[PDB]
Amino acid sequence: SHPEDDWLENIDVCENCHYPIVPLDGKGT
Amino acid sequence: RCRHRRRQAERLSQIKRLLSEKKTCQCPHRFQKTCSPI
Ligand SMILES: [Zn+2]
């Protein structure tokens, strides 16, 4: 397990759609 | 001690609802070629 609040705080936003981009993580199964 | 410090993210709430609606960087794609569920 690992905190999911850090990434959110340091979240980034694309410079095209003005939306919050999501950096590659790996998986979630 | 460090009174003027924006700890909590400002876009947090904004991005909070956005995430709930899965309204994130919907940018195009560069050659998918199967795999990668989107
Ligand atoms: Zn984008």
Mutation target vs B (from A4, A5, A6, A11; most B CBs, 10 A cutoff):
A11
**Number of neighbours of residue A17 by Cβ within 10 angstroms:** 14
Buried b (16+ CB within 10 A) or exposed e, B14-33: ebeeeeeeeebbeeeeeeee
Angle, CA B25 vertex, CA B23 and CA B31 arms, to 5°: 125
Question: What span, in angstroms and rounded, lies between the C-alpha atoms of B10 and A24?
Answer: 23
Question: What span, in angstroms and rounded, lies between the C-alpha atoms of B18 and B20?
Answer: 5
Chain B touched by A17 (CB under 8 Å): yes
Cβ–Cβ below 8 Å for A13 and B19: no
Chain B touched by A21 (CB under 8 Å): yes
Name the experiment that determined this structure.
NMR
